[PDB]
Amino acid sequence: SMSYTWTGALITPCAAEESKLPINPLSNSLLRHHNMVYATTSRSASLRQKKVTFDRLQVLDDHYRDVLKEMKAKASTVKAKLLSIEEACKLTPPHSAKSKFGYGAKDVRNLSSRAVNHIRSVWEDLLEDTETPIDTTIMAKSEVFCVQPRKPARLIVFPDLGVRVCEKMALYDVVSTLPQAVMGSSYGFQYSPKQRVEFLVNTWKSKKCPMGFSYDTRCFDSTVTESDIRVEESIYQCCDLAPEARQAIRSLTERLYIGGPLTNSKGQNCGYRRCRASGVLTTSCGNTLTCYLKATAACRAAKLQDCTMLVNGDDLVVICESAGTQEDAAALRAFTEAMTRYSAPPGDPPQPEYDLELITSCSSNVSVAHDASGKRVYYLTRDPTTPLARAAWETARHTPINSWLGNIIMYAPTLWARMILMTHFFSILLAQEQLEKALDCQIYGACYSIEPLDLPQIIERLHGLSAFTLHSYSPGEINRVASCLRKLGVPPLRTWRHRARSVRAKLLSQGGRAATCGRYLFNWAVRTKLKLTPIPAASQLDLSGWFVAGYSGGDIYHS
Ligand SMILES: Cc1ccc(S(=O)(=O)Nc2ccc(Oc3ccc(C(=O)O)cc3)cc2C(=O)O)cc1
Ligand SMILES: [Mg+2]
């Protein structure tokens, strides 16, 4: 069927939309070619609609059914709990989109009577009505990028706040534990960056002759069929569930997940969706299961040998035993035709890779550097263009979510995160006296509130002390960074080193945690290297829930 149907009403913004990076003294200090940075707006929605609107072709075979059963066998071992209204409310980010029924995220978090009572009526409605398509809002997403040698806006679709809290009640526990139970080590979100690198590196070295490839599905959400979503529900249904949770899942599947009506911000009927909605709780888990199911079966169809996969939502990376250059290229092509029949045609043409550093997955790649001892150390990195562009935008404009903070956290060991992001934001924060103010950022889609001053302990725990001593990065990595800086008009190494020494001096003079940030985060900026010993606070850190599951588009806040 058609992924989308349109009435002709426009996808409208609900306020003024900024498209250009402001000329700001602070941001200009980070990136000078401000004209290369732009934010997508509803003005390009029409372009996106065209690309995501098409008929889906799907042919299921024995391999598909075989794998599905294997997956359900594992799902069968799970017992999901069903969250209380209060537990669900507490999972709503403070900046979550308000309800059209007289209450916002704040009322939900504070368990206001109007919010809880409306939430209860919505739940009761899910138990009683198994057919009525739930309404959803379609909006053009506002994201920042750097121009290329421009991307149209992504379209997000999400139900009312009341429904969102109900989703949490019925499926939060499911989407948090089912993926790992069914997919085991193949489930990417259970890994921290370091553990992802470890898994990838060990898998790679475990092959006699490794061959790997990332597989990019063209607009994955739109390729998801009604069949796919019901297959997804069938897996969820193998879980031991509370009666009400079971009905809620059945109802949400038919009324929301398989599709439904689209309404713009002006309240006008916009069209109909028959594919994955980007803004529901099951999107990450659902996409991961779907991608995993299709790929695993595609692998069997292509006769790839000793396949080891890593799936993060619609992101897939496979590492196998090579059968030789020619055979590999043919097998990859067969794999692709298999995925195509399953309704997951390729966007960028997949290509086999024989150098692990050249494989980009989850927008990142593995690279190696050296610690102070001179020992090789693997770590996760990525082209810094987008991170830097967004860092600039966030410097000039206040944003609910600070991607720079998440990038410092997730890419702490990288040359660019340390040289530029750390230096830039700490100098600004120290100057504005806000080192103590907690800020929100996202990790695998979930929102977290973090204190910049705790960064040293966080980095030590997630990446190890070596994150503060890496040097001698790869020529490929160094060149990518340097070319990025020239492209965006970002100051050179020497400028950042000078700025870094300057902030480090100040951080040290403040004592306490600031001093710790100065010693560990910027030891790279000085010749007189301080001794970096284990930070006591890094022992009493509970960072386990950070890497349990993916929640992008799931409106999740972890506290
Ligand atoms: C966190 C960090 C760690 C070590 C150093 S270093 O000064 O000890 N060595 C390097 C300094 C710059 C660099 O990569 C660049 C970056 C920018 C430019 C440039 O501005 O053109 C040139 C080389 C790579 C390395 C290395 O150890 O491999 C600087 C920053
Ligand atoms: Mg894709």
Curated annotation (Swiss-Prot):
The reaction(s) this protein catalyses: RNA(n) + a ribonucleoside 5'-triphosphate = RNA(n+1) + diphosphate
**Full-protein residues shown:** 2420 to 2982 of 3010
Q: Mutating I401V: what's the consequence? A: In strain: Isolate pCV-J4L2S
* Post-translational modification as stated in the protein's UniProt record: The N-terminus is phosphorylated by host PRK2/PKN2.
Q: Tell me the function of this protein.
A: RNA-dependent RNA polymerase that performs primer-template recognition and RNA synthesis during viral replication. Initiates RNA transcription/replication at a flavin adenine dinucleotide (FAD), resulting in a 5'- FAD cap on viral RNAs. In this way, recognition of viral 5' RNA by host pattern recognition receptors can be bypassed, thereby evading activation of antiviral pathways.
Q: Which organism is it from?
A: Hepatitis C virus genotype 1b (strain HC-J4) (HCV)
Q: Which residues form the RdRp catalytic domain?
A: 210-328
The prosthetic group or cofactor this protein requires is: Mg(2+)
**What does the record note about the cofactor?**
Binds 2 magnesium ion that constitute a dinuclear catalytic metal center.
Briefly describe activity regulation. Answer: Activity is up-regulated by PRK2/PKN2-mediated phosphorylation.
Q: How does it sit in the membrane?
A: Single-pass type IV membrane protein
Residues reported in the UniProt entry to bind Mg(2+) 2: D216, D314, D315
Q: Which residues carry this modification: Phosphoserine?
A: S29, S42
What is the protein name for this chain?
Answer: RNA-directed RNA polymerase
Subcellular location, record wording = Host cytoplasm; Host endoplasmic reticulum membrane
Subunit and interaction comment: Homooligomer. Interacts with non-structural protein 5A. Interacts with host VAPB. Interacts with host PRK2/PKN2. Interacts with host HNRNPA1 and SEPT6; these interactions facilitate viral replication. Part of the replication complex composed of NS2, NS3, NS4A, NS4B, NS5A and the RNA-directed RNA polymerase.
